[PDB]
């Protein structure tokens, strides 16, 4: 496939994900993100494994994980370096870190999970992910990303679920249509 038509395919894919999210119910949307992420990592689950906690945060409980789910959206595509892609999480992560600090919430029990879907950008998978130092400093137990094109565990502390720790140091790249 010529590059232009491939990038078009990835744009239509991004559009499809947005169309779904904009019409989904809140907890269902968050659970859906968790399912897509677990599928990316080939982590088995049954539907009964997902639960909502008494208090938010987090959003979705799964086998010891406390998934705090957030969306990184933007609405002819450009390839964005992994560093710049990772930086797209910063505004929301800063706001959460602040809000939770003000409430006396233990950041260290939360496994952050970003659903990243940009119509204007596609990751440049030839570029390396830099250490997530700002996000490490915010005190989360773990931070992961998933989108139609890829999934990656950015970091996970020793106390994080083993399935997170097992997937450090790697990115999962989806063929078109496989991520969603």
Buried b (16+ CB within 10 A) or exposed e, 110-147: bbbbbbbbbbebbbeeeeebeebeebeebbbbbbbbbb
Q: How many helices (H) and strands (E) does the chain have?
A: 6, 9
Pairing state between β 50-51 and 150-156: unpaired
Residue with tokens 């080939």: 42
Question: Phi/psi at 172 (nearest 5 deg)?
Answer: -100, 120
Resolution (A): 1.8
- Per the listing, tokens 């019409």 go with 23
Residue 154 near residue 132 (C-beta atoms within 8 A): yes
Phi-psi label, residue 46: left if phi above 0, alpha if psi -120 to 50, beta otherwise: beta
CB within 8 A of 10, min separation 6: which ones? 77, 122, 148, 149, 176
**DSSP 8-state code for residue 119:** S
Distance CA 164, CA 162 (A): 5
Which of 147, 175, 156 minimizes the C-alpha distance to 67?
156
Are the C-beta atoms of residues 171 and 153 closer than 8 Å to each other?
A: no
Give CA–CA dist 129/126, Å, rounded.
Answer: 10
What is the Cα–Cα distance from 80 to 164, expressed in whole angstroms?
25
Sheet holding 150-156, edge to edge: 50-51, 60-62, 65-73, 111-117, 142-146, 150-156, 172-173
From CA 171, how far away is CA 152, in angstroms rounded?
5
Instruction: Please name the method used to determine this structure.
Output: X-ray
Structure tokens at 34: 């968790």
Give me the number of domains the chain comprises: 1
Residue 164 burial (C-beta neighbours within 10 Å; 0-12, 13-18, 19+): buried
Q: Are 72 and 60 in contact (CB under 8 A)?
A: no
Name residues whose C-beta falls within 8 Å of residue 7's C-beta, 6 or more positions apart in sequence: 76, 77, 122
CATH number, position 150: 3.40.1540.10
The residues, any chain, with a CB within 8 Å of residue 129's CB and separated by 6 or more, are: 82, 83, 86, 152, 154, 171
SS3 143: strand
Residue in this structure with the two tokens 């003000």, named with its chain if needed:
102
| Number of neighbouring beta carbons within 10 Å of residue 30 | 24
Structural domain of 54: 2-180
């Amino acid at each position: 496939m010529n590059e232009a038509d491939y990038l078009r395919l990835l744009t239509r894919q991004a559009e499809q994900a947005n169309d779904f999210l904009s019409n989904a119910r809140k907890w269902d949307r968050e659970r859906w993100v968790c399912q897509r992420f677990l599928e990316a990592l080939n982590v088995p689950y049954r539907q009964e494994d997902f639960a909502a906690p008494g208090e938010q945060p987090p959003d979705v409980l799964f086998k010891g994980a406390g998934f705090e789910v957030f969306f990184v959206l933007d609405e002819r595509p450009q390839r964005i370096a992994a560093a710049e892609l990772q930086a797209r999480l910063a505004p929301t992560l800063r706001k959460k870190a602040h809000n939770y600090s003000e409430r006396g919430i233990d950041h260290g029990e939360l496994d952050l999970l970003a659903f990243v879907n940009l119509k204007r950008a596609v990751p440049d998978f030839n570029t390396p992910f830099p250490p997530p130092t700002e996000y490490l400093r915010q005190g989360w137990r773990s931070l992961s990303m998933v989108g139609p094109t890829f999934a990656r565990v950015l970091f996970a502390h020793s106390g994080a679920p083993e399935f997170l720790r097992a997937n450090l140091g790697r990115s999962i790249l989806f063929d078109a249509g496989v991520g969603l």
